[PDB]
């Protein structure tokens, strides 16, 4: 059994749990204390000391996109996250990185900041969301005909959409119901219905992170 060192509000951690559970893999979930990080995480990651990291075959694999690609690659016989063609796995990667960087910074300043960046970031969020709806054109999912790579990349950001609708104070549903409803399309599936923790609690911890630092 593979061991997951994760963080319950971590969306990237949510990437790993969604992927492994999206297949048919039985794995053990471990809560990390970032004040008291397990001997397992420091011996698995002595540098960034980051989650998520999964040990399989006595081997630690770290980074969310990297753990998930590792999942596709180690158990590829049922539900592939990738389409068969080079350019299309390339277009899941292109948008994986998009969700991962510019989109994840924009959202990070949504829940993590006050004033100027909060607002201009609300923009950014409305903008990046605006592009991702556009290229998807009309796909129920993302990375292939079923649950994909870039969809697991973004679905974890469903459990923060509601935090973003209070601190960013928008309704991306009433300016783009397209996206959260991928997310709720994707919520009919059990990798999302039992991996992504409760929406309210994310709001709680997002607001409480806001409480702890000024």
């Amino acid at each position: 059994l593979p061991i997951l060192l994760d963080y319950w509000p971590s969306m990237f951690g949510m990437r790993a749990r969604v992927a492994l559970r999206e297949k048919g893999v039985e794995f053990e979930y471990r809560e990390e204390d970032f004040s008291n990080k397990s001997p397992l995480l420091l011996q698995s990651n002595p540098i960034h000391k980051k989650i998520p990291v999964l040990v399989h075959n006595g081997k630690p694999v770290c980074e969310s996109l990297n753990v998930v690609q590792y999942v596709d690659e180690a158990w590829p016989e049922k539900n592939p996250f990738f389409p068969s063609d080079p350019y299309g796995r390339a277009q899941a990667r292109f948008w994986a990185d998009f969700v991962d960087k510019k989109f994840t910074d924009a959202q990070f300043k949504v829940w993590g900041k006050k004033g100027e960046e909060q607002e201009a970031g609300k923009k950014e969020f409305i903008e990046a969301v605006k592009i991702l709806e556009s290229e998807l054109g009309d796909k129920p999912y993302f990375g292939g005909d079923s649950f994909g790579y870039v969809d697991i990349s973004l679905i974890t950001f469903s459990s923060w959409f509601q935090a973003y609708e209070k601190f960013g104070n928008f309704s991306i549903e009433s300016e783009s119901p397209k996206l959260i409803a991928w997310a709720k399309r994707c919520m009919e599936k059990e990798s999302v219905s039992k991996s992504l923790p409760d929406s309210e609690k994310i709001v709680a911890y997002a607001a409480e992170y806001r409480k702890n630092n000024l």
Binding site: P83, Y87, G137, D138, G148, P177, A181, R185
Partner: protein, 569 residues
């Protein structure tokens, strides 16, 4: 940005680039749709190099019945994406009926571009053949006043409703239309029959510089001119005193006419002296605006017979035929509009879908496989199937079309058609005869007012507890609530079957709501449908709505000219 010459050569070479632009459009449409579930069931994934080969041989053809549940699943609370993707901002309907039940179809902003772009073209081909003044106006008997919200809290709507109050309508159509007569508020007036009256009044209002009259259909025109035919004495009077007729009751739009109105007595002397000299309103369309370059609208197919009563209205003024398309996907444009209605044909526009045709060539019908768009045979008739942004993939709409010629490398289509008809049986009934009889029974309470009932529709609403059916109505003129309330009772009192008797008397299904709608409503489901991309077999309107109906539905809620739940019961 709208211009004449540079857009059309792009299009000439677009029309000659016919095959790559659609194969590209198909491969666009696949690459934007690689995630579609039915395709997983079909075996697809991406680029390949037999993709068009893989497509026509691996993905099966489909019907309204089979498509209903998927786009149904999109709409009811599960905001979830299926045969398109993105839960679409709107859903559409198809004329005729899915074994008699309603069908659902996804709408994306792509369609709005489709609308705009082919019109950007379309105005350019007609203004080529009928050049227009850049400071004038047009009379548009057009409406988009209505917006319901579906059972899932999801917007699903007509081409109409979706185009005019779309955020992109105003900026986009501003450079390709002569400014509308009507302030948009009266266009989206909750009462489009009082809005019509004001609409005909609006185009009547800025006439001297008016370049054309328009409706999608010349029956939008002859019914507008049969509406016109029903209302201009009162039009003199309401306009004369600078006080509008007591016929109009809606205060937001009444505010719109009051910001416009003041007392002016000479002018009436005039209107009355013109329209008289005719022998019954032959060439009225140039009477109203002697300077309209044309009368624009679809004039082929299911309704060749009112081009003559409109020619009758239009006189010797040329009668110009409208381009083809729908919410399901647009097809073909008359890039030579100067052509007569009977000989009028329309050329396909390239990136709005990927198109295929089933031949009728054998007897009836024919077990042969579809051939490509440039592979179609001249003079011969094929039925169109559609692959596009509207959630339709090699979809059999069910309509037979004739090929008349080629505009460079792109073909020109003809429609001798009318009804896409074979039916089957259902569950939105309450026998169609019963529902027609319901309207008939209750509507003669309105007939006491020198009124007839022009058309009707319905809706099953099972979000509410208990659920209630919603009966819909297009009448020829305005009246008061008491009689309409009475009318709803009679619709309840007219479904004559033993069954729903147990139902509503037990109220396990809650009271019928009659939302009476305003004029042009069922005219717009029509105006939607002949233009629809297929063939002219597009006119049997579905009469009662399961949760799977869409074109009549956005129409239903916001033009509640009135809405009532039965006081009996």
């Amino acid at each position: 940005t709208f211009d004449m010459n540079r857009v059309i050569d792009e299009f000439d070479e677009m029309t000659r680039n016919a095959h790559q632009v659609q194969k590209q459009t198909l491969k666009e449409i696949l690459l934007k749709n690689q995630s579609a579930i039915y395709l997983q069931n079909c075996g697809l994934n991406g680029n390949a190099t037999d993709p068009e080969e893989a497509f026509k041989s691996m993905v099966p053809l489909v019907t309204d019945v089979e498509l209903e549940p998927y786009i149904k699943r999109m709409v009811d609370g599960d905001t979830s994406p299926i045969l398109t993707g993105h839960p679409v901002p709107a859903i559409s309907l198809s004329s005729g009926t899915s074994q008699g039940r309603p069908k659902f179809i996804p709408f994306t902003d792509e369609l709005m571009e489709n609308t705009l772009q082919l019109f950007r073209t379309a105005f350019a081909f007609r203004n080529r053949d009928f050049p227009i003044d850049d400071n004038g106006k047009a009379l548009q008997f057009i409406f988009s006043s209505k917006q319901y919200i579906s059972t899932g809290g999801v917007p699903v709507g007509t081409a109409t409703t979706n185009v005019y109050r779309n955020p992109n309508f105003k900026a986009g159509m501003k450079s390709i239309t002569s400014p509308s007569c009507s302030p948009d508020e009266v266009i989206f007036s909750p009462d489009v029959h009082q809005a019509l009256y004001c609409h005909l009044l609006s185009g009547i209002l800025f006439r001297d510089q008016v370049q054309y009259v328009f409706a999608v259909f010349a029956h939008g025109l002859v019914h507008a001119f049969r509406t016109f035919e029903q209302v201009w004495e009162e039009i003199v009077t309401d306009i004369k005193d600078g006080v509008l007729s007591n016929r109009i009751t809606v205060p937001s739009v009444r505010t719109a006419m009051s910001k416009l109105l003041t007392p002016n007595p000479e002018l009436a002397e005039t209107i009355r002296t013109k329209c008289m000299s005719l022998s019954n309103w032959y060439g009225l369309i140039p009477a109203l605006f002697p300077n309209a370059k044309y009368v624009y609208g679809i004039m082929t197919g299911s309704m060749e017979p009112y081009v003559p009563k409109l020619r009758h209205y239009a006189g010797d003024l040329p009668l110009v035929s409208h381009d083809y398309g729908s919410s399901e996907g647009w097809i073909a444009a008359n890039v030579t509009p100067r052509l007569s209605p009977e000989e009028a044909t329309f050329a396909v526009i390239p990136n709005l879908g990927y198109f295929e045709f089933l031949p009728v060539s054998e007897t009836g019908e024919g077990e042969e496989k579809p051939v490509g768009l440039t592979q179609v045979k001249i003079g011969e008739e094929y039925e169109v199937v559609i692959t596009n942004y509207a959630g339709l993939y090699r979809y059999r709409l069910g309509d037979v079309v004739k090929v008349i010629g080629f505009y460079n490398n792109t073909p020109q289509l003809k429609f001798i058609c009318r009804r896409n008809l074979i039916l089957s049986i259902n569950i939105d009934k309450n026998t169609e005869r019963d529902l027609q009889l319901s309207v008939e029974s209750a509507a003669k309470r309105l007939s006491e007012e020198k009124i007839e009932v022009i058309d009707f529709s319905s809706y099953i609403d099972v979000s509410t507890d208990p659920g209630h059916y919603a009966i819909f109505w297009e009448i020829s003129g305005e009246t008061n609530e008491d009689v309409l309330q009475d009318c709803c009772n009679c619709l309840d009192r007219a479904f004559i079957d033993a069954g729903y008797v147990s139902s509503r008397k037990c109220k396990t299904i809650g009271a019928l709501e009659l939302r009476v709608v305003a004029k042009g409503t069922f005219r717009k489901i029509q105006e939607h449908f002949l233009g629809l991309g297929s063939s002219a077999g597009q006119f049997k309107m579905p009469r009662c709505v399961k949760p799977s109906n869409a074109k009549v539905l956005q129409i239903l809620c916001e033009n509640v000219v009135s809405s009532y739940f039965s006081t009996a019961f």
